[PDB]
Structures are given as structure tokens and as C-alpha cells.
């Protein structure tokens, strides 16, 4: 199973599961600098791509 992976498969799987997805975020402690949820969400894609 491992030997059959290549760059194309990794790109397709990552584009499926990461790109332009709504994440879940948890923060604990001095987290005043943690970005807003809109900023985290907008960081899940690129305008160049």
C-alpha cells in the first residue's frame, strides 16, 4: 500500500480533505492573538490557485 503512493495521489487526497474545508479549532490559555474564525477559514485556500 505504501509503495503505491506518489506525488499525484498525495496532491489529490490533500486537495480532497484539506482544501477549502471548514475546520474545528480549540484554544486554551492566553489566546488573545488567535485569529478570528473568518481569518482561519479564509486561510484554507489561495487566491493564486
Amino acid at each position: 500500500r505504501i509503495a503505491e503512493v506518489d506525488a499525484r495521489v498525495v496532491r489529490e487526497v490533500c486537495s480532497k480533505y484539506f482544501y477549502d474545508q471548514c475546520p474545528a479549532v480549540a484554544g486554551f490559555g492566553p489566546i488573545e492573538q488567535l485569529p478570528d474564525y473568518n481569518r482561519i477559514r479564509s486561510g484554507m485556500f489561495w487566491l493564486r490557485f
Binding site: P35, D36, N38, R39, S42
Partner: protein, 378 residues
């Protein structure tokens, strides 16, 4: 790591617009300050395209403006946009000032005073613009404002002659008014940069009047989209005026060429100065009238000194709210009176309105503040 936070030029924009912490509960009244940013640029654009077809010669000024209206491709659109943008600018400006007065934003003394300077500069630019068409009202407004400095003792006539560049209003006056009208908006923009700079240090206010460091959100994307919506509504109102009522806020008399001999019997200035024209008509005294006119505008500089309440904003101060709306109604009364002939009973009403205006600003607001301080037991 991120170029946005380390580049020399983009860092300023990042700290000014993108990552600025702002309160989460500022209402729509905070949009007007951004709208004044838009309108200014609009007047710089449209006006810059009117200067490519305008000639300041006294014999070929009215004709040049009619050439712009009739011969230039889409020139009527640009002309009437520049004409109504002044009314939009002054509506936004008065809303900005009322917002600052109601919610106690005047405690930022530096920003407040720089804003007073900006208000005076914009008033001068608007007045100098209205002379360039060279109609009846242009001539008889330039005459009156230039003679307004004749009340100063011992130097009045010389200053009047120096501003006129002659013994009367003539070609030299029109040319220098054109030059000043061209150049002054750039100075206004330069001062507005300082208006923003002094506000960057202290942060912004909110309707509650309570410090909002606990609840902050980034400026982008939350107040960029509200800026876009406000700009859209502004464009809607401006285009409604331009396309469905091009001459509602104007005056017919400025469509006749300037006549140095005759004077219309119902002279009046533009709608956004009438209140001053109501004050000056009230006092039957030249120097007293001019001083009252100056003080009615410069009394905003003394507003921070008269604050006597423990609470910053009027959100929790019912008596102050009642007095504020009485002041607004009185300003509307003065604006109504300024458009009427000097005759009975409007003289008495104008005098009473001016007295009420000054009394409300100077006497009653601190008294209400002190009474409210005693009611809350502190």
C-alpha cells in the same frame, strides 16, 4: 515570515486597515467617517475632469460651463456629479459631527481640533467652488463674503481690496478663486492623514461609551464589507439626485450670467450655510453679526471644556438626550428661517432661535450633567 507584516510599505497599510483592532458593537453612524473618505476622492476625480474644459476668463466662463454641459461627451454627468457631491459631502460631514457630539468622542482633543480645521477648510473650498460658474449667485456671494472682512477695524478696507485684487469683484478674483479651489483639496487630504494618525494611538469609541479592550475584532473582513455596503448606499443616493432630480438642491438664479448692476430680490446661499445666514441676519450690528457668525462655528472648539458628566456617552443620560434633540430641532429651525425674507414674524423667530442655540450649547448642557451627577450619587 509574512511579507505583509515586515515589508516597509505594506506594514503601514496592515497596521492601519487590515489588522486594526476595532470594537465589535459600533453602529452604522461610524460609517460616515469612511464615507467622507470616499466623497473627497470622488470630488477630486470628477473635478479633475472638469478642469480639462474650464477656462477662468470672466468673458468665457459661463460659456465654457455650458460647453461642458452640451458638447463634452457625457459632460453633463460629470458636472452634475461634482455639483451634488458637495451636498452629499456636507450631509456626511454634519452626520459625522453629530455622531461625535452625541457619543462623547470629543474627549480626543487632538482629533477633535484637527477635525474642526478640516471643517473650516472644506467650507472654504465649497464656497470658492460655487463662484467659478460666474452666475448671479456666484457674483453676489463672492461680494458678500469678501465684504465680510470689512468689519475688522482699521484694516478692513485694505484686506477687502487685497482679496479682490482691485476695487470690485472682477477677472482677477475669479482666476485666484479658481487656483485656490484647485489646490485646497490636496491640503485637506494631507490634514485628513493627520486626523487619522492622531486617532490611531487612542483607538476608536463605541456607543456604550465604555472601554472595549475586552471585546475587539479585526477591521478586515468585518468593517470592510460594511464600508462596501455604505459606499453602495451613498452611490445610490447620489445617482438618484443626479438622474431623477438634477436641480432640486440648486438655485435657478445661477443659470443667468453675472450682472454687476442688478441684484435678485431673493438672494440666499446654498442650503448648507443657511443657518449661519440665519444668525448673521439676527443681530442688527455689523461687527456683532460677523463675530456671532464666527463664534457659531468656532464654538465646537469649546465643547470639550464644558463636559461635566461622569459618563462619557449620552446613551444613559436622558436629560442630555432631550437637550441634544432640542438643539437639532433648533438647527433645523434656523435652516428654515435662513431661506425666508427678512420680515415679520421671521425676525423674532430667528433671534429667539439663535439665543436658544447659544444657550443650549453653553448653559444648559453642563447644568444637566451636574444634575445627573447628583442624581446618581457621585
Amino acid at each position: 515570515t509574512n511579507i505583509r507584516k515586515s515589508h516597509p510599505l505594506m506594514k503601514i497599510v496592515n497596521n492601519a486597515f487590515i489588522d486594526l483592532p476595532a470594537p465589535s458593537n459600533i453602529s452604522s453612524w461610524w460609517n460616515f467617517g469612511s464615507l467622507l473618505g470616499i466623497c473627497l476622492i470622488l470630488q477630486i476625480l470628477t473635478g479633475l475632469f472638469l478642469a480639462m474644459h474650464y477656462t477662468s476668463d470672466t468673458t468665457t466662463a459661463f460659456s465654457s460651463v455650458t460647453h461642458i454641459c452640451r458638447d463634452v461627451n457625457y459632460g453633463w454627468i460629470i458636472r452634475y456629479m461634482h455639483a451634488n457631491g458637495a451636498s452629499m459631502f456636507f450631509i456626511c460631514l454634519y452626520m459625522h459631527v453629530g455622531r461625535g457630539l452625541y457619543y462623547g468622542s470629543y474627549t480626543f482633543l487632538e482629533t477633535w481640533n484637527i477635525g474642526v480645521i478640516l471643517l473650516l477648510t472644506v467650507m472654504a473650498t465649497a464656497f470658492m467652488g460655487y463662484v467659478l460658474p460666474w452666475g448671479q449667485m456666484s457674483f453676489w456671494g463672492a461680494t458678500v463674503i469678501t465684504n465680510l472682512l470689512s468689519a475688522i477695524p482699521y484694516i478692513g478696507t485694505n484686506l477687502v481690496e487685497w482679496i479682490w485684487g482691485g476695487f470690485s469683484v472682477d477677472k482677477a478674483t475669479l482666476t485666484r478663486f479658481f487656483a485656490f479651489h484647485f489646490i485646497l483639496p490636496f491640503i485637506i487630504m494631507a490634514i485628513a492623514m493627520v486626523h487619522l494618525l492622531f486617532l490611531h494611538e487612542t483607538g476608536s469609541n463605541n456607543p456604550t461609551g465604555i472601554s472595549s479592550d475586552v471585546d475587539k475584532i479585526p477591521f478586515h473582513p468585518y468593517y470592510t464589507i460594511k464600508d462596501i455596503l455604505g459606499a453602495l448606499l451613498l452611490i445610490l443616493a447620489l445617482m438618484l439626485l443626479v438622474l431623477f432630480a438634477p436641480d432640486l438642491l440648486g438655485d435657478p438664479d445661477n443659470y443667468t450670467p453675472a450682472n454687476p448692476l442688478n441684484t435678485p430680490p431673493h438672494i440666499k446661499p446654498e442650503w448648507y450655510f443657511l443657518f449661519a445666514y440665519a444668525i448673521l441676519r439676527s443681530i442688527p450690528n455689523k461687527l456683532g453679526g460677523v463675530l456671532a457668525l464666527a463664534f457659531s462655528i468656532l464654538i465646537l472648539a469649546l465643547i470639550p471644556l464644558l463636559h461635566t458628566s461622569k459618563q462619557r456617552s449620552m446613551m444613559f443620560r436622558p436629560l442630555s438626550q432631550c437637550l441634544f434633540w432640542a438643539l437639532v430641532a433648533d438647527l433645523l429651525t434656523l435652516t428654515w428661517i435662513g431661506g425666508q425674507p427678512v420680515e415679520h414674524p421671521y425676525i423674532t423667530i430667528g433671534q429667539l432661535a439663535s439665543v436658544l442655540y447659544f444657550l443650549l450649547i453653553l448653559v444648559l448642557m453642563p447644568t444637566a450633567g451636574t444634575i445627573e451627577n447628583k442624581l446618581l450619587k457621585w
